[PDB]
Design a protein around this ligand. Structure first.
Ligand SMILES: [Fe+3]
Ligand SMILES: [Fe+3]
Ligand SMILES: [Fe+3]
Ligand SMILES: [Fe+3]
Lengths: 325, 325, 325, 325
C-alpha cells in the first residue's frame, strides 16, 4: 500500500553500440573492476581507492581544464565557492582524479553529505531514497578516453565536477535531501514526478543571481556545450515551479530546449516543500541527523517527540541571546 | 582569555604500588599493547579489535554475572532497557568481551554517540570537550584477573557495563553531551565544577522512579559493593541541584557517603541547563549534528542562522500535522 | 532620523466642485455633525451611534442590493463568508445602516481588529500606523443620495461592504496588520511604496481560487462597475509581487487598467514579509496582542524577551499533543 | 462529562454575626448599592465609578499607610515596582480610593489583565475561568470603618493593594492566567486542588529573592499582621511544589501556620505547568490574545493552526536578528 522505504542509513545496502568504449575490451574490464567496488561496498566502510591510469587521468585533465574555463562566467556562485573549497582542501586539480573517500570526508564536514560508490544509474526510488539520508550514490569510473568532451552516462567527471561542488552549499544540500525526504514511500507516479523536478533542478536547473542568469544543474556544469547553450538565447527559460516542472517531458540525448530558473535556493526550497505538502500521504518523515535515521511522524506522540528536540534548540538560542547581551 | 576548544570532531585528535597487576609483567605488556591502539587512533577509523585471552574473558565473565544479578533490583529502567538492547544486538554475554567498534556502531544508530579508544583517564577539559561531540573516550583493556570485583581505574568492564547502556537512552545521552557543551572554552574553575557535577550524576547519580530509588551512575552500575551501598540506609542522599553538587568534595578510594537523586532525566537536564546559563561567557555553542561540529553563537547573525534550521523543522511538524489530519 | 511612530494603541489619538453634494447645505451639515464624532473620539470609548435619516438609509439600500447581486460570482470566498457572518451576527441588511460600534465588537471577537471613526482620508503614515494595531480608521457618513452608484471618497458603504468583510478573515487581517507593522518608522519613500502595495492589494487586489479569478480589494467590492471590469478581458492582470506593485503608478478617477493577482493570502503574506525584510532598518517591531503595544526589537535582549513568549506557546502545543495522545 | 467553560471573554457574563458592620444599616445599604454595579455589569463597559464617602476614604488611608510602611522590607520586588507604577500612573495615594476603571486601563496596558466588578466571593470554577481570560473579578466596596486593620472578606483594599500590583508583573500575570487556563473544564476535584494551589501562591505565597524571603501573596500584602508573621520564625515554610500545595489543608480565620516559597516566578510557572500536564484531559486550551478567546486544541488540525501563529512569530524574530546585524 505504502511501498517500503529505508528508515536507517544502513538499509541503503538493500537499495551501448553508440558508447565510445563499447569496442574496447581493456576499458570494459576496467569498468567491471570499478563496478566491483560498488557491488561489494557496505555502509560505513572507507570507500576503496582506485589507482587511475595515466590516460584516465588525461581524460579527466581535459574535461577539467575545459569546463574550468567557463565556471567564472557561467556558474552560480555556490558552485564557484564549493569548487574553490574542493581545490583548497580536497586536492582538486587537472593532473589527478580525486578519490571518493577524500571527497566524502570533505562533504561530511561541510554539509553532512557523504558519498557511496554506485555501479551506474540506480532506480529512481532508490536514488531519491539515498538522497533522503544525505547520501549521494556516486560513480567511480571515467568516460572512455576517445570522447572526453562527451559522455552518455554519468561518470566520475560528471559527479565530481557537476554535483559535488553544489552539495558543499548548506541550502542546496538541504534542497536535495528534501527531494529525497519527499519521495520516501511515495507512489511510483509520485516518484516519476519527483525525478522530473530533480531533472530540472539538481541536474539542469538555472538560477538568477544579481539580475544574471547562471547554471547550477550538474548536467550543465559537467557539460561544455550544454553549459554555453543553457545561458544562450536558444532554449526557453521558465520560472521554476515544482508543479510545472514535474510534468515537463524531457529527453536524454540532445541539449534541453526548456529550463527552469529559480530566484534563490531558499525560494526554490520553499516552493519544493509547499509541493511536498500536496503529496497524498498519511504521514511525514523527518530526518534524525544524530543517528542518520528517518523518523516517521504518524501520530500526535511521534510529532510531540520531535517537537521536544526543537524546544531544546530554542532553549539554546535563548541562552545565546543573553550571552551576547 | 577563552581557552581553545575543538569546533570539529576531527580536532579531538589533538585532545600504582597498590594496583593488582603492578607486579605482573605479562599484564603490564598487555596494557602497553592495548594503550597502543588509543595512541595510534585517528577520528573516523574503525576501532581496532582486541583478541582477548581466555583469562581476560574470565575476569569479564565474573564482573558480568555478579553485577547482572543486581540490575533488576538496583538499576534505573534506562539501564535495564539499554542492557537488554546491547544483549539483543551487540552480543553482550558472559563468555566474551564485546569489541568497541561493534558497541560504537550500536550507539551511533541509537543515540548518535560513538566511542573512541583512550589510553587511561584523560584531562577533565579534554574529556568533557569529547562529550560535546557525543564521543565517549573509552578504555579497551581489562582489570587484572586477581581482583575481578575491584578496579582502581576505569577498565572496559566499567565502560561497557557502567556507561554504555545509559548512553543508549535519548534523554541521558543529551544530558551527557550538554555537560560537555557547557564546558567548551570554560575556565579551569568552571571545568572542575562541571567535572564535579559529572561525578555526581554520570558516575554516581541516583534517580527516583515510581517512588523507588535507583542507580544510573556508571561507577555504581559497574560496582557490586557500591551498588548495594548506594541504595542502603548508610549514605546521605540529597535532591540533585547542579549548584550544590558542583562544590561537594568527594574522594576516589572508598564508597561515596553522599549521593544526589534526580527526579527524572528531563528534570535533571533542565536543572543542568539553567546552571549552564549562569556560566560567565560571551557566547553559547550549539551542536551541528549534520557535520559533528560546534557552532559558536556570538552575534545576531550566527543566532539567526541556527534559528533558520529550527524554523525548517517546525515547517516539517506543521506538515506532519495536516498529514495525520 | 527615524520618524516617530506610536508604540501603544492609546497613541493613535495623536495620529469638491464635482462632488454630488457640494451644493446641498443640509448634507454639508450632516457631514460636519458626523466628522464631529471622529474629532471628539478617544481610544477605548464605545463609538457613538449615528441615527441615519431615511434617505441615507435609502442610498445604503441601493448600493447594498446592487453589489450584493455580484458577490456570489465576483467575490473571493473570504468576502462571501465574512459577509454571511456579518448578516448573521451584525445585522447587515438592506433596510438599515450598521452602527460602527456593533461592527467593531464583531471584528474584535473574530480577528482582533477594531474600528475607529475617522473624519476622511488620513495621512498615509498615520493610516498604516493604525493598521499596525489592528485598528481600521473608518468613515461614518454616507455618500450623497444623488449618485448612489458612485462615490469619490470612501464613505461608510465602501468601508462596511468593501473592507470589513475581508477583515473578518484570519489570514487577511494578519496581511493588513503586516503592512502597517512594516510601515512603522519607515521613511516617507518607504511609506509611499507601502501605500502602493496597499492600493494594489487591500483596495484593488485580485486573487485566484480554484482556477478562477476573484476580487478582494475593497475598492472593487464596493464598486458595481469596477467590480465587473476587474474580472473582464479589459485590464491587464499581473502576478502579485510587492516589489513590482510598490512602483506601479495608479490614479484615482477611472477604473484601474492594471491589477495584481495573488495565489493565496498566505502566499501574498509570505511575499509581503520577504519584502518587508529588505526595508532599510536598524530594528524590527512585533505586536504585543495582550497590551495592544508595539515592541521594538533592537537588541539581543528584546529579541530574547519575545522568544520566551514563543517558547511558552510551544510548551502549550507539546502538552496538547500528549492530551490527544 | 466535561463541564461547560467559557470560550469567549463575553461569556463570563454567564459566570455574618461577627462582621464589623453587620449591625450598621447605613453600611449594609452602601453595600447593596455597590453590589448593584457588579450585578448590572456586562463585558466591555467602562466600570462605573463609585463616589467614596470621606469615612470610606479614611478607612482606605489607614490600611494604606500602615501596609505601605512594611512593603520596603517585606514585599517582593515585583510588588514594589508595580506599587510604584500604580502611584506614578494610576493615582494611588492615601487620601483617595482608586477607581476600578482607571486600574483596569492601567493593567490592560501593562500586562493585558483587566478588572471586572464582582459582588463578593465567586464560585471557585467561575473565578479560575475568569483568570483564564486575564480578567480579575474585583470587589468595589470598602471594609467597615470600625476595624480598618482587619477584614473577613476581600474588600477593595485587599484587591487594590494586595492583588493588583503583582498583576502588573509580566511573569506573575502569566502564572495567574495559567492557573485559570488549567482549570477550564476540569473536574470539581481538580478545581479544589487548583483553588488550593492558588491559595498558597496568589493569596499567601512567599518567594526567595537574593537569599531573602519575601511575600507576594495578596492575602499577605493587604494584611499588616500576617505580613509580619509570614516572614517570622513562627510558621513552617516549605519549598513550593504544586502537588504538595494542592492537598495542604488550610483555614480562613487565623494566620497560616504553613507557607510555600517559590525560587522565582519563572520556576513556579514551570512547576505549575508540568503540574497542569498531569491533569486528566482529552484536550488542551491556548489563549488567543487577539480575540480574548480560548482555543480548544483537540485534534492535529487545531494544533497545526496555533503552530502557524508561532511560526509567523519566529519569522519576525529572524527578521529582527538581521536588522540588528
Ligand atoms: Fe547527474
Ligand atoms: Fe567512569
Ligand atoms: Fe478604502
Ligand atoms: Fe484575594
Amino acid at each position: 500500500k505504502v511501498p517500503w522505504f529505508p528508515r536507517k542509513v544502513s538499509e541503503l545496502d538493500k537499495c551501448d553500440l553508440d558508447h565510445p568504449g563499447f569496442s574496447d575490451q581493456v576499458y570494459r574490464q576496467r569498468r567491471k573492476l570499478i563496478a566491483e567496488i560498488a557491488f561489494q561496498y557496505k555502509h560505513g566502510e572507507p570507500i576503496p581507492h582506485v589507482e587511475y591510469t595515466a590516460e584516465e587521468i588525461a581524460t579527466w585533465k581535459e574535461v577539467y581544464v575545459t569546463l574550468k574555463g567557463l565556471y567564472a562566467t557561467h556558474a552560480c556562485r555556490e558552485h564557484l565557492e564549493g569548487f574553490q573549497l574542493l581545490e583548497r582542501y580536497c586536492g582538486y586539480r587537472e593532473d589527478s582524479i580525486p578519490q571518493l573517500e577524500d571527497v566524502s570526508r570533505f562533504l561530511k564536514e561541510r554539509t553532512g553529505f557523504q558519498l557511496r560508490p554506485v555501479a551506474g544509474l540506480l532506480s529512481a526510488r532508490d536514488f531519491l531514497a539515498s538522497l533522503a539520508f544525505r547520501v549521494f550514490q556516486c560513480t567511480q569510473y571515467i568516460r572512455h578516453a576517445s570522447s572526453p568532451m562527451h559522455s552518455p552516462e554519468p561518470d566520475c567527471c560528471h559527479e565530481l565536477l557537476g554535483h559535488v561542488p553544489m552539495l558543499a552549499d548548506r541550502t542546496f544540500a538541504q534542497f536535495s535531501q528534501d527531494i529525497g525526504l519527499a519521495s520516501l514511500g511515495a507512489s511510483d507516479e509520485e516518484i516519476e514526478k519527483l525525478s522530473t523536478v530533480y531533472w530540472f533542478t539538481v541536474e539542469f536547473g538555472l538560477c538568477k543571481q544579481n539580475g544574471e542568469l547562471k547554471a547550477y544543474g550538474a548536467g550543465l556544469l559537467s557539460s561544455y556545450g550544454e553549459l554555453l547553450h543553457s545561458l544562450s538565447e536558444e532554449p526557453e527559460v521558465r520560472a521554476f515551479d515544482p508543479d510545472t516542472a514535474a510534468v515537463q517531458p524531457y529527453q536524454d540525448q540532445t541539449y534541453q530546449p526548456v529550463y527552469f530558473v529559480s530566484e534563490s535556493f531558499n525560494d526554490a526550497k520553499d516552493k519544493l516543500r509547499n509541493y511536498a505538502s500536496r503529496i497524498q500521504r498519511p504521514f511525514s518523515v523527518k530526518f534524525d541527523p544524530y543517528t542518520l535515521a528517518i523518523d516517521v511522524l504518524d501520530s500526535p506522540h511521534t510529532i510531540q517527540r520531535s517537537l521536544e528536540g526543537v524546544q531544546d534548540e530554542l532553549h539554546t538560542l535563548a541562552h545565546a541571546l543573553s550571552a551576547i547581551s
